[PDB]
CSV table of C-alpha atoms and ligand atoms in Angstrom, one decimal:
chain,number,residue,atom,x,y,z
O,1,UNK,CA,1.0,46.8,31.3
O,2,UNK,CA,-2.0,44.5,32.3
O,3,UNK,CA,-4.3,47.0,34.1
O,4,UNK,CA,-8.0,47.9,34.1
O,5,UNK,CA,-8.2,51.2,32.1
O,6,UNK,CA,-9.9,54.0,34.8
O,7,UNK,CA,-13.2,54.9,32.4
O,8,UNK,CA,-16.1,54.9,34.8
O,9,UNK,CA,-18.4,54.0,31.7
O,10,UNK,CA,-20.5,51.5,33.4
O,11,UNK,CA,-21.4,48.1,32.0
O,12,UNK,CA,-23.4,45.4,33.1
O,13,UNK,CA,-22.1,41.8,32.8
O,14,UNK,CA,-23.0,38.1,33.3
O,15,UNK,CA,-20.2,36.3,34.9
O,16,UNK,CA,-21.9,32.7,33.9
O,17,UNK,CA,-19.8,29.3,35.8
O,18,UNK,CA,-20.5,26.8,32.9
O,19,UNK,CA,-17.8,25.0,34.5
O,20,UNK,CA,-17.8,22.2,37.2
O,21,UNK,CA,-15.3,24.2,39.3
O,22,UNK,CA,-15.5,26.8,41.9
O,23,UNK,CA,-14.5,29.8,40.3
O,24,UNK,CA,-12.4,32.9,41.6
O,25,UNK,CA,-12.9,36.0,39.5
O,26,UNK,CA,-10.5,38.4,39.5
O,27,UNK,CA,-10.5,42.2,38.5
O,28,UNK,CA,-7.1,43.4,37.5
O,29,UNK,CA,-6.9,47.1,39.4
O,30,UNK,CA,-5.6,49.9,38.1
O,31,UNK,CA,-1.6,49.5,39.2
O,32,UNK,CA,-2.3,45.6,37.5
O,33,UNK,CA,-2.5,44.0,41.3
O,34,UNK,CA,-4.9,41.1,40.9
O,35,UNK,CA,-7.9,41.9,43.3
O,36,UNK,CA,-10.0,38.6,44.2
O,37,UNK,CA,-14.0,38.6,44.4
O,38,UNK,CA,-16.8,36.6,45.7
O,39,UNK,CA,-16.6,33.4,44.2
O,40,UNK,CA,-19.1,31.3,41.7
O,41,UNK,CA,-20.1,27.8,42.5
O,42,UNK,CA,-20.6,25.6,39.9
O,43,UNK,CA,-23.4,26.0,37.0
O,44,UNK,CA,-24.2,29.5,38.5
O,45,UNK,CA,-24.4,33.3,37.3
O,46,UNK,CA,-24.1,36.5,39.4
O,47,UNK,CA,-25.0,39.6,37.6
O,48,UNK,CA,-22.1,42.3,38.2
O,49,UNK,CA,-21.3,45.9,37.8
O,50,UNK,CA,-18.0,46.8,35.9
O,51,UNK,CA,-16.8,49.1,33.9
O,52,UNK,CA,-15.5,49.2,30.1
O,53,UNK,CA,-12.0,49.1,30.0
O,54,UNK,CA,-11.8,47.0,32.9
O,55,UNK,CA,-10.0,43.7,32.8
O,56,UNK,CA,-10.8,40.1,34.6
O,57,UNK,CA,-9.6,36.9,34.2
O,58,UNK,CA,-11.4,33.4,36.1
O,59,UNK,CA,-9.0,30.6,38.0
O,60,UNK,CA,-10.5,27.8,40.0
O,61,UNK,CA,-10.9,28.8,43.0
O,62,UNK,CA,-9.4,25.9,45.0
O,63,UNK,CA,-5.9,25.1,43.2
O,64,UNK,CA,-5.9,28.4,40.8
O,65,UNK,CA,-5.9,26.1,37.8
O,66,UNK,CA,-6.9,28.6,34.7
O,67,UNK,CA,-10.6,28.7,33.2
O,68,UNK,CA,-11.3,30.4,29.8
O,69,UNK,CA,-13.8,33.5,29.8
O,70,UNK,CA,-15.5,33.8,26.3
O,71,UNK,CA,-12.9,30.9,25.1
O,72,UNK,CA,-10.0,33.5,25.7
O,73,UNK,CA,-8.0,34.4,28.6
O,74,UNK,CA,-8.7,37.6,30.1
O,75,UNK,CA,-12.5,39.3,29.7
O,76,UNK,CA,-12.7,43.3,29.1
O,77,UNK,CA,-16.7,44.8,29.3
O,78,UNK,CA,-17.9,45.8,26.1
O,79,UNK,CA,-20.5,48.5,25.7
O,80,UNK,CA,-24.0,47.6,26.4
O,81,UNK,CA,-26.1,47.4,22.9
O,82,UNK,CA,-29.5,48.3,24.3
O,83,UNK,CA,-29.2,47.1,27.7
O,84,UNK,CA,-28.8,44.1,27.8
O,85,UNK,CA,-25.8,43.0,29.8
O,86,UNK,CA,-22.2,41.3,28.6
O,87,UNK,CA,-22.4,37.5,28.9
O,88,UNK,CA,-19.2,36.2,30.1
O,89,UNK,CA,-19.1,32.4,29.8
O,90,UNK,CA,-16.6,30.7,32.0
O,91,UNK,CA,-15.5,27.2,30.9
O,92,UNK,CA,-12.6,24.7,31.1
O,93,UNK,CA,-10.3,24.4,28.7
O,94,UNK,CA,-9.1,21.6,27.3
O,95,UNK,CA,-6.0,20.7,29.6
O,96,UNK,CA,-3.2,19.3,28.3
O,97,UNK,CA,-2.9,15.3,29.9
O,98,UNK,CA,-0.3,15.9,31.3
O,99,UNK,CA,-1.7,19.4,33.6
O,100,UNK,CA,-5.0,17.5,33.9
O,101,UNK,CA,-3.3,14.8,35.5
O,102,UNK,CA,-0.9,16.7,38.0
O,103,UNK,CA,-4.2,18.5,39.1
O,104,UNK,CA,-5.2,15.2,39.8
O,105,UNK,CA,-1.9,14.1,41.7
O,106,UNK,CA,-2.2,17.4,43.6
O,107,UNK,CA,-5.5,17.0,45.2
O,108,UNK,CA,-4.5,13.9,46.3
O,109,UNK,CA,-0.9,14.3,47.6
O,110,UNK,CA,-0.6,16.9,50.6
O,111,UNK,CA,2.7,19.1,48.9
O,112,UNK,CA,5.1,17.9,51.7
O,113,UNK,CA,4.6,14.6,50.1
O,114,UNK,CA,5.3,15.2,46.7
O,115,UNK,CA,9.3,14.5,47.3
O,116,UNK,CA,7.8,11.1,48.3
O,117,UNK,CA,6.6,10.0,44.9
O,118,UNK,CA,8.2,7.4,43.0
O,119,UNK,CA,8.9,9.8,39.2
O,120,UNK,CA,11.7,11.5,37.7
O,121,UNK,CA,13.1,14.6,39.5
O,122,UNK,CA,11.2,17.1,36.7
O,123,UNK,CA,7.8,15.8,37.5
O,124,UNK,CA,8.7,16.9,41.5
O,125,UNK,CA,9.6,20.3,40.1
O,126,UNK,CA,5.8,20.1,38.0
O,127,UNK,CA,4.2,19.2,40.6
O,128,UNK,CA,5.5,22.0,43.2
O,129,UNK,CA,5.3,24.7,40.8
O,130,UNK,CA,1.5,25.3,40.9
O,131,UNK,CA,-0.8,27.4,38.7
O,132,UNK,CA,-0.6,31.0,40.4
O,133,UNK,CA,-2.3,34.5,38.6
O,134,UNK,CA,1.0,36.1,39.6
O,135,UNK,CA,3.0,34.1,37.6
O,136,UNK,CA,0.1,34.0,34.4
O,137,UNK,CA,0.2,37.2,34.6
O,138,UNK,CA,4.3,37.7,33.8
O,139,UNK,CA,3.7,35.1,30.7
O,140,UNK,CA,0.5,37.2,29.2
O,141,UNK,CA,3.2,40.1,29.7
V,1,UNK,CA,-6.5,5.6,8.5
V,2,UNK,CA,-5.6,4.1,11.4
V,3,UNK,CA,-2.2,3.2,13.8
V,4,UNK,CA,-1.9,0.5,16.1
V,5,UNK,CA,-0.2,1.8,19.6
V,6,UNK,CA,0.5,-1.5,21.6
V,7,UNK,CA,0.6,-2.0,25.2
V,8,UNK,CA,3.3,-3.5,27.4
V,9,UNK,CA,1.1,-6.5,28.0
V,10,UNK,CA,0.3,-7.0,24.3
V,11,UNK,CA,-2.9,-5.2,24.0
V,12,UNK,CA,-3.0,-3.2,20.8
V,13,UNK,CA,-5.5,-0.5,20.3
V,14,UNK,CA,-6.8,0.7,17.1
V,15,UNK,CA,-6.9,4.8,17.0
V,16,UNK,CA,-7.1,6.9,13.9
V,17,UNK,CA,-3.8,7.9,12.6
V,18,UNK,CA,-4.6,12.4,13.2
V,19,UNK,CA,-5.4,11.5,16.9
V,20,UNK,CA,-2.4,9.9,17.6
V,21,UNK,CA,-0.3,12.7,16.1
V,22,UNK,CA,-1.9,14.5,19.2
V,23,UNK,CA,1.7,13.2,20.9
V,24,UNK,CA,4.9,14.2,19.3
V,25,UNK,CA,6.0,11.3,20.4
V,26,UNK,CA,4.1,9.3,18.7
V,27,UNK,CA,5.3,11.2,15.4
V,28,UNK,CA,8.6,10.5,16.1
V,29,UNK,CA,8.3,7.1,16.4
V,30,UNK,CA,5.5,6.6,13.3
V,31,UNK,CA,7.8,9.1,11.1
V,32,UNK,CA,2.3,2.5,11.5
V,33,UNK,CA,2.4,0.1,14.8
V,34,UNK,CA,4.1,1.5,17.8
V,35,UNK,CA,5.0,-0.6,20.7
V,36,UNK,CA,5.0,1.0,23.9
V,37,UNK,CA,6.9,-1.2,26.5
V,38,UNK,CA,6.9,1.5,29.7
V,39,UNK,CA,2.9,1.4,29.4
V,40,UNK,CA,0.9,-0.8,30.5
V,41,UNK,CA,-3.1,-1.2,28.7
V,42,UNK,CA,-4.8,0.5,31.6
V,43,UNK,CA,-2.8,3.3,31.4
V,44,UNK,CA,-2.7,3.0,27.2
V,45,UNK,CA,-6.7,3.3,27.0
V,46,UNK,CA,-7.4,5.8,28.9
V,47,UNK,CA,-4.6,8.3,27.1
V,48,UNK,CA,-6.5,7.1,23.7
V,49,UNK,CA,-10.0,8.1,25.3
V,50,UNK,CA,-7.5,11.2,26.4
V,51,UNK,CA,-6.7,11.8,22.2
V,52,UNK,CA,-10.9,11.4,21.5
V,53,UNK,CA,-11.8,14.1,24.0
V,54,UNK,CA,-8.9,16.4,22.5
V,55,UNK,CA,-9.7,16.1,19.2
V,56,UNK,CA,-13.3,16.2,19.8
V,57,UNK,CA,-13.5,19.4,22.2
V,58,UNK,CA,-10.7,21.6,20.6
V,59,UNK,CA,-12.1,25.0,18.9
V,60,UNK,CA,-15.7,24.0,19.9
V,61,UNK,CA,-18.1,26.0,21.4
V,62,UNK,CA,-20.3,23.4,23.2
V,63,UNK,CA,-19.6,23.5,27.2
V,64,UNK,CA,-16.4,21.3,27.6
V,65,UNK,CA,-16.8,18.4,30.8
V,66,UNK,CA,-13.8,17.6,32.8
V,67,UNK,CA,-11.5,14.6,31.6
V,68,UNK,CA,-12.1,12.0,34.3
V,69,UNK,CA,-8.9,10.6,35.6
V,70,UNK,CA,-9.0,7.6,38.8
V,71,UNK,CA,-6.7,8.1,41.3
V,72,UNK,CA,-5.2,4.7,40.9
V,73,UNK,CA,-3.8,5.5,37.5
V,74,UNK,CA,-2.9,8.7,37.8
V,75,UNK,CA,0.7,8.8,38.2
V,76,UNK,CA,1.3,6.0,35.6
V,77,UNK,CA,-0.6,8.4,33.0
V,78,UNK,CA,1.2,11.5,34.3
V,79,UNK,CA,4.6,9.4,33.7
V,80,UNK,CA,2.9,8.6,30.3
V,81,UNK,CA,1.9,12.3,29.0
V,82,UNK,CA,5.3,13.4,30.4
V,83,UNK,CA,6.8,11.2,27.8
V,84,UNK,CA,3.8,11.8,25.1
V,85,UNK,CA,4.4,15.0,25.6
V,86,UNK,CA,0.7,15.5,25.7
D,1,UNK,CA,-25.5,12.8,16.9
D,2,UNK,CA,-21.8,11.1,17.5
D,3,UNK,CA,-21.3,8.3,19.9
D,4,UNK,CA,-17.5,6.6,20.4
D,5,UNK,CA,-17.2,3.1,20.8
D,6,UNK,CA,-14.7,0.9,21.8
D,7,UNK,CA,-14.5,-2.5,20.0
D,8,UNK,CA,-13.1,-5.1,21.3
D,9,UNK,CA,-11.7,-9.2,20.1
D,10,UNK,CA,-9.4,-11.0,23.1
D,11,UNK,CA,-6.5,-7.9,23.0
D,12,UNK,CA,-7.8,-5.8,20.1
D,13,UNK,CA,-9.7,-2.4,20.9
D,14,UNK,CA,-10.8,0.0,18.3
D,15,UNK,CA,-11.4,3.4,18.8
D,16,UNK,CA,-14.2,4.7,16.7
D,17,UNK,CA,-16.8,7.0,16.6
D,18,UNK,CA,-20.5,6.8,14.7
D,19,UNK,CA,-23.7,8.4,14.2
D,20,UNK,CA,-26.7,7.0,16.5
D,21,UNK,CA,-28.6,6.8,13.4
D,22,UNK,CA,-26.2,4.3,11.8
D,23,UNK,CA,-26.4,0.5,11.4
D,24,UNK,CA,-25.0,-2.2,13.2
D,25,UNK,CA,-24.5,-3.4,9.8
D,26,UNK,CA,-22.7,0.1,9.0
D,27,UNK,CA,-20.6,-0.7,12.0
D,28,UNK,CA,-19.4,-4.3,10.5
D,29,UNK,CA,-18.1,-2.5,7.4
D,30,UNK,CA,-16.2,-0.4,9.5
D,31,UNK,CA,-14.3,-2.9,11.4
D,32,UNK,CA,-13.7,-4.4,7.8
D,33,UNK,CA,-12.1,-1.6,7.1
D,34,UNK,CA,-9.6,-2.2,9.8
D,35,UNK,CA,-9.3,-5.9,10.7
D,36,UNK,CA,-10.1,-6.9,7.0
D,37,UNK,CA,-12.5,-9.5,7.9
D,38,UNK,CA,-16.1,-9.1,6.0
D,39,UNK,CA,-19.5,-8.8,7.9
D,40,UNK,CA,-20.8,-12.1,8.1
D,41,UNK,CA,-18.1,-13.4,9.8
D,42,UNK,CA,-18.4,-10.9,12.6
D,43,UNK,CA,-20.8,-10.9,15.5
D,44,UNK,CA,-21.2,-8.0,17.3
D,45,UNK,CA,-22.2,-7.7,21.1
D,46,UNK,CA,-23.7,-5.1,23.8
D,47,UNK,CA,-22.2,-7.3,26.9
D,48,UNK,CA,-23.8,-10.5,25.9
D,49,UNK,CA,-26.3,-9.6,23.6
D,50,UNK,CA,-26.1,-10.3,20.1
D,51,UNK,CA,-26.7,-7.3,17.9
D,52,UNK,CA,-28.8,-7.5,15.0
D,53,UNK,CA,-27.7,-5.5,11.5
D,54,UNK,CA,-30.5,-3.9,10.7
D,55,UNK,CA,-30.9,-2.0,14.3
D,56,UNK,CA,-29.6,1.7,14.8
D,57,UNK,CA,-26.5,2.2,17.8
D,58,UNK,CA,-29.5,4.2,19.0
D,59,UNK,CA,-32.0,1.5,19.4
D,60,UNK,CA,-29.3,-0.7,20.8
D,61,UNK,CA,-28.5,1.6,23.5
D,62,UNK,CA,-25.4,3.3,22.1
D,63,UNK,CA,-26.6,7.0,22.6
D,64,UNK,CA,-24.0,10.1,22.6
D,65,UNK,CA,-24.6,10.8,26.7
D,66,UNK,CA,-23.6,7.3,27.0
D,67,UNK,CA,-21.4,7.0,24.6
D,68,UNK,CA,-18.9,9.9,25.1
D,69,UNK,CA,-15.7,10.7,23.4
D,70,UNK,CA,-13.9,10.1,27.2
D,71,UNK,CA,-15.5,7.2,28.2
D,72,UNK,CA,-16.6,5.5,25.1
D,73,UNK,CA,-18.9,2.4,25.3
D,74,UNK,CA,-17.7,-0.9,24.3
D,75,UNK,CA,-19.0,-3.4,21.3
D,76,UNK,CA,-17.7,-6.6,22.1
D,77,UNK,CA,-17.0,-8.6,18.9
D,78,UNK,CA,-16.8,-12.1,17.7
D,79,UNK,CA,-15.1,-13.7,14.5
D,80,UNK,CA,-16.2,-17.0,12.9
D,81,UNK,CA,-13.4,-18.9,11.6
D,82,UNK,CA,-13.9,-21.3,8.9
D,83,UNK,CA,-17.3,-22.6,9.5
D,84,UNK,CA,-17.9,-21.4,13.1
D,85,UNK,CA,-18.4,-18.2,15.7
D,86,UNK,CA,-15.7,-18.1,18.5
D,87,UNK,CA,-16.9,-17.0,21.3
D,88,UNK,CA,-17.3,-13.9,22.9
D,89,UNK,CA,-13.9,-13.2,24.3
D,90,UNK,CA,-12.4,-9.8,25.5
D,91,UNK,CA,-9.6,-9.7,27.6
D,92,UNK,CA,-9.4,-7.2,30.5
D,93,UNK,CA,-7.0,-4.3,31.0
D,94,UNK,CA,-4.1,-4.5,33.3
D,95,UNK,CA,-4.5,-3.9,36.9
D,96,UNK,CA,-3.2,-0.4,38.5
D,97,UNK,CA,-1.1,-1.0,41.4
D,98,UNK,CA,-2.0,0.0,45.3
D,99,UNK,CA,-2.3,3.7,46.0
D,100,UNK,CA,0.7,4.5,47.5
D,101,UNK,CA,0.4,5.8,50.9
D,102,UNK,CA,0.4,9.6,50.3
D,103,UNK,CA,-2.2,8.9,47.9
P,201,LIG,C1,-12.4,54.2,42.0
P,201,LIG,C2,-12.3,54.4,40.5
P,201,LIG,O1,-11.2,55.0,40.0
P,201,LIG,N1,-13.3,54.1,39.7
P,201,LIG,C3,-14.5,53.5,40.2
P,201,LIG,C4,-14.3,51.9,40.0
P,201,LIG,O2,-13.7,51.5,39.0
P,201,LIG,N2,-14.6,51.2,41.1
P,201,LIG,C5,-14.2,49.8,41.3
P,201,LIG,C6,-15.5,49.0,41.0
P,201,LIG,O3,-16.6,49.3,41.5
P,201,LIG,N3,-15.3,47.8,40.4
P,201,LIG,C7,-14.1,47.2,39.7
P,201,LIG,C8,-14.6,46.2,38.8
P,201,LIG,O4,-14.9,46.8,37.5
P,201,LIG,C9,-15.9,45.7,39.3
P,201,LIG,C10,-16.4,46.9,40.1
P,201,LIG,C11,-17.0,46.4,41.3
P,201,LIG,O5,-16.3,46.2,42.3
P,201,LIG,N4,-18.3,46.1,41.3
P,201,LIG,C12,-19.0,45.5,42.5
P,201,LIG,C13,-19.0,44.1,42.4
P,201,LIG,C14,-19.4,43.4,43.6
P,201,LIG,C15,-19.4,42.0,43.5
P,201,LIG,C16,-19.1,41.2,42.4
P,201,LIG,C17,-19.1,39.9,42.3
P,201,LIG,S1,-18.0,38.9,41.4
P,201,LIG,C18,-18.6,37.5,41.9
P,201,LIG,N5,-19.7,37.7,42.7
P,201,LIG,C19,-19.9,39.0,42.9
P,201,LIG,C20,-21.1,39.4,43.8
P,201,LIG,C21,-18.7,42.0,41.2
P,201,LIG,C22,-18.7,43.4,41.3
P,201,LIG,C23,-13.6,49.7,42.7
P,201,LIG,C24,-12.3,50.5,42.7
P,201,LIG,C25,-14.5,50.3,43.8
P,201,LIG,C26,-13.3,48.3,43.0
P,201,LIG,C27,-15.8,54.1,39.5
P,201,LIG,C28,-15.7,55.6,39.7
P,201,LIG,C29,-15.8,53.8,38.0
P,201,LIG,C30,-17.0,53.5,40.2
């Protein structure tokens, strides 16, 4: 269902990191396998070729925790109105306390560890069950 | 309109009433002082400075900063959001 | 512009927000509001500096990059009871425990 539509209408975008994170864009192909590209250090903008119809969506780069594009999920080009290219501002979202702070726990505990930590068995089950395109991708479905 | 949420060492802080309600939890137990005897004040301020930063950065379009979190608290405020449920 | 404050009396800490532009006077009717005590029988501090009433958060160094929804800057305040002011007296947060050692 999620797949880039095959147009070859070009359009020009922005892919703009307003984000402190490293950023992993990826370009959903056209059987819907997520295909990852250069990534985007923080605070900086690479000026891309894509096509309309085409479909991306922006994960940290590090853990694959989920960054908005636009304040949405997923980013489709748009025609260019008198050339001027798409802008397509990636930000954080407002976590939830509780993912913001198993991000946390996570860069600090190695994963073999996690069974080590003094919490209740669900938070073990959180904590292993990382943020993953794979699986964002069968929810947005 | 404000709540008092209280700490389990006694500190009580002061938040307005719609930030609160950011936790379900919190509903629960309003529907206006709430004792929390699982968490401690260091723990308890940062997950109001948490209910600011919520309120304050939901549907805006200014760039949003991270939420800082220190690694010594961190799995006392993960135990607390798990409960908060937020 | 907004800036969010923390005020703080031995275990009491409000969480507020306010303009820069507004009074430190402004900011005593506020915490009458809450604790029902009126303004001349509050003192409010930037660590051990008395604040005057008629100066602006702004001028007393409560701006909004400082003074940020998660990390909010803290107003210390003092009640006088009866005749005189209490001292300055805010009582620290809990300490966290050791990092365990996967941490
Ligand atoms: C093959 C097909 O059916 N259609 C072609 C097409 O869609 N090609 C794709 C294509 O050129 N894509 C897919 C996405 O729309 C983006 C574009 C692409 O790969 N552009 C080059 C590019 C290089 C680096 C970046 C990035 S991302 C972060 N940093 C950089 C430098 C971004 C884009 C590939 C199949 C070659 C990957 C077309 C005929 C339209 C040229």
């Amino acid at each position: 269902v999620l797949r880039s539509v095959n147009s070859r209408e070009p359009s020009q975008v922005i892919f703009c990191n307003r984000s402190p994170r490293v950023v992993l864009p990826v370009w959903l192909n056209f059987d819907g396998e997520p295909q990852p590209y250069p990534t985007l250090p923080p605070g900086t903008g690479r000026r891309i070729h894509s096509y309309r119809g085409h479909l991306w969506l922006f994960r940290d780069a590090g853990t694959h925790d989920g960054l908005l594009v636009n304040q949405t999920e997923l980013f489709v080009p748009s025609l260019n109105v008198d050339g001027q290219p798409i802008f397509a501002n990636i930000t954080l979202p407002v976590y939830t306390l509780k993912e913001r702070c198993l991000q946390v726990v996570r860069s600090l505990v190695k994963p073999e560890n996690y069974r080590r930590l003094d919490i209740v068995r669900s938070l073990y089950e959180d904590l292993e069950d990382h943020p993953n395109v794979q699986k964002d991708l069968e929810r947005l479905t | 309109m404000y709540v008092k949420l209280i700490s389990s060492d006694g500190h009580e802080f002061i938040v307005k009433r719609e930030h609160a309600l950011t936790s379900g939890t919190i509903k629960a137990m309003l529907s206006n002082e709430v004792n929390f005897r699982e968490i401690p004040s260091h723990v308890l301020s940062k997950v109001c400075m948490y209910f600011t930063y919520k309120v304050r950065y939901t549907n805006s379009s200014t760039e949003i900063p991270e939420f800082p979190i220190a690694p010594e608290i961190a799995l006392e405020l993960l135990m607390a959001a798990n409960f908060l449920d937020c | 512009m907004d800036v969010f404050l923390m005020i703080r009396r031995h275990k009491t800490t409000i969480f507020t927000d306010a303009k820069e532009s507004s009074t430190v006077f402004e900011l005593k009717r506020i915490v009458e509001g809450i604790l029902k005590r009126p303004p001349d029988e509050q003192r409010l501090y930037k660590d051990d500096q008395l604040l005057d009433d008629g100066k602006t958060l702004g001028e007393c160094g409560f701006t909004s990059q400082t003074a940020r929804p998660q990390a909010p800057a803290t107003v210390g305040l003092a009640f006088r009871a009866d005749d005189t002011f209490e001292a300055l007296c805010i009582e620290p947060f809990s300490s966290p425990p050791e990092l365990p050692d996967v941490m």
